[PDB]
């Protein structure tokens, strides 16, 4: 948008005291990410900068009441959120407000926290023999530990050796600990460092096709940490075994317990293991002096199954800290809303958990873990009233918060609310602007709005 | 014959109904009971219940 207009007199080089409308010029097909700009000058190198000055500002989402003229030109405007007078003229859809009290909007504070406070976590899944065992398994044969009804809390795995992969295929790591499956199997084994990439759905690799075959649609996780500190024996580490020779590839999640001889030629061997007859089993070589690609890595995968059975394994719960004397979002396992949590003296029964009233609304809940009766009450709210003596008289206004003690939003407390913007005088005049409870406001004298 | 159940000819039969301002002529095999008078009963006529 743009608009060109001259000046009327020699200004002090400030923004003029006038109103002007801006018309659109161009609507180029753009939309690239733009967050920073810069203005170019015109240096007259006879280097001279000349004389320039701009008033770059920032735009904000606001509502405006635009006045159109008989010819379609914008003449006036209201900010609708700057001062209570502008809000009154905005909600009245006019520009010359009369003398009296007007309700503009409703005062209401916003919550601060988002506490949950879910119940405790009792049933812990068995993860002490699959992440802390001495020797998990070999590569030619792997183990499988069926897990039962529990809540799979993967946050406890932070105590392992750092710098370990946690690439979860299918599922999302952010939403990982909210998932009710039916069964989860753990397959742990130890391989080299250059074979961690081979453990993936459908990827080329000798160990990925002759030892362990992961399916292409595998939706689980894979964990592999460095084991060079404890699984590296300098005196001939050969306790691990991995297959290298086989007739064909393995099926997804297949157990190759066959130990038959391998034949790369055409002559019968019949169990000799000599020339042209090799043994399809080779042992690793783990030495603390080898490179990272040769260090041992305990790889454990978690296959997740999904059936229409009673969900045995699920995810843990947050159970955040509880805050009192502040309107926050309460999520006590059965409700979602706003309210102030305060200690209540209402004695409940051992089987009761919620609480109603005459209005049929929740007003007291029992904490899940630490049994204690609370008192849910909505935050402070009311009606914002603006006392205006009229635009033709002045522009000073007074705000009246109906039913608010104006302690958590001159200030004077009345029985009808709280008036902020008018002083209370001890005199007694005729009522000009009715407020309530015998309080009246007037624009008298140093002119200002007074209450009496 | 060796193809899976994903593509097999299903003998789909669509039975479309139609009800206008005309006396019905085909209902279920419900045995018509006896008609009594001067007593509140639950009439179950063709389109009246």
């Amino acid at each position, epitope marked *: 948008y743009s608009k060109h207009t001259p000046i009327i007199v020699r200004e002090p080089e400030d923004l003029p005291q006038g109103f002007s409308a801006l018309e659109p010029l161009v609507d180029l097909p753009i939309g690239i990410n733009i967050t920073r700009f810069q203005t170019l000058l015109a240096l007259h190198r006879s280097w001279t900068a000349g004389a320039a000055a701009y008033y770059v500002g920032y735009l904000q989402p606001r509502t405006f009441l635009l006045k159109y003229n008989e010819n379609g030109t914008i003449t006036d405007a209201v900010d609708c959120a700057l001062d209570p007078l502008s809000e009154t003229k905005c909600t009245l859809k006019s520009f010359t407000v009369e003398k009296g009290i007007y309700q503009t909007s409703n005062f209401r504070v916003q919550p601060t926290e988002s506490i949950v406070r879910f119940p405790n976590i009792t049933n812990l899944c068995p993860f002490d023999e699959v992440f802390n065992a001495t020797r998990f398994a070999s590569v030619y044969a792997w183990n499988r530990k069926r897990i039962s009804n529990c809540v799979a809390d993967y946050s406890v795995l932070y105590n392992l050796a750092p710098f370990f992969t946690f690439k979860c295929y299918g599922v999302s790591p952010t939403k990982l600990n909210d998932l009710c499956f039916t069964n989860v199997y753990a397959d742990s084994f130890v391989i080299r460092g250059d074979e961690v990439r081979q453990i993936a759905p459908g990827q080329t690799g000798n160990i990925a096709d002759y030892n362990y075959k992961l*399916p292409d649609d595998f939706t689980g996780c894979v964990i592999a940490w460095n084991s060079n500190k404890l699984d590296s024996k300098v005196s001939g580490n050969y306790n691990y075994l991995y297959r290298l020779f086989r007739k064909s590839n393995l*099926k*997804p*999640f297949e157990r190759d317990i066959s130990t038959e001889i391998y034949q790369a030629g055409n002559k019968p061997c019949n169990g000799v293991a000599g020339f042209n007859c090799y043994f399809p089993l080779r042992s690793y070589s783990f030495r603390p002096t080898y490179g990272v690609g040769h260090q041992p890595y305990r790889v454990v995968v978690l*296959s997740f*199954e999904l*059936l229409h059975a009673p969900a045995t394994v699920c995810g843990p719960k947050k159970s955040t800290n509880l805050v009192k004397n502040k309107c926050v979002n309460f999520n006590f396992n059965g409700l979602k809303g706003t309210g102030v949590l305060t200690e209540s003296n209402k004695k409940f029964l051992p089987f009761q958990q919620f609480g109603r009233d005459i209005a049929d609304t929740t007003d007291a809940v029992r904490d899940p873990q630490t049994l204690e009766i609370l008192d849910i009450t909505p935050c402070s709210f009311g009606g914002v009233s603006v006392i205006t003596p009229g635009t033709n008289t002045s522009n000073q206004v007074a705000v009246l918060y109906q039913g608010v003690n104006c302690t958590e939003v001159n200030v004077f407390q009345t029985r009808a609310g709280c008036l902020i913007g008018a002083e209370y005088v001890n005199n007694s005049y005729e009522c000009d602007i009715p407020i309530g409870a015998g309080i009246c406001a007037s624009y008298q004298t140093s002119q200002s709005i007074i209450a009496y | 014959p060796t193809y899976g159940v994903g593509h097999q000819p299903y003998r789909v039969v669509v039975l479309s109904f139609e009800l206008l301002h005309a006396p019905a002529t085909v209902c279920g095999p419900k045995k018509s009971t006896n008609l009594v008078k001067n007593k509140c009963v639950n009439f179950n006529f063709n389109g009246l219940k």
Partner: nanobody
Amino acid sequence: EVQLVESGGGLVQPGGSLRLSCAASDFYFDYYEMSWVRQAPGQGLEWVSTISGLGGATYYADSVKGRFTISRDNSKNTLYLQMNSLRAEDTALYYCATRSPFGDYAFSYWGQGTLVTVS
């Protein structure tokens, strides 16, 4: 693709026994899930049982679970179903089908299915 069929359905007296031993031709079942689904006259395909391929446990069904059991020798292809103390409402259309884990519950290719009635 797969040419699995059903065989074993027949007239069974109330409280008898039956062997619904199905088979298949060629498919990857070592990591799939095989299940059973019954079809009562006028109802849908209710779940009966499910044998896991990665595990080997038998996930049972509602109150009629205390009479059914499944097994598998896993040699070439089979899916047994032992019938113990069949009651009146046990007659339905069983379909020896299967599915695939790590995905939606939409079952895989079904079979021709058989019929077992009690009287």
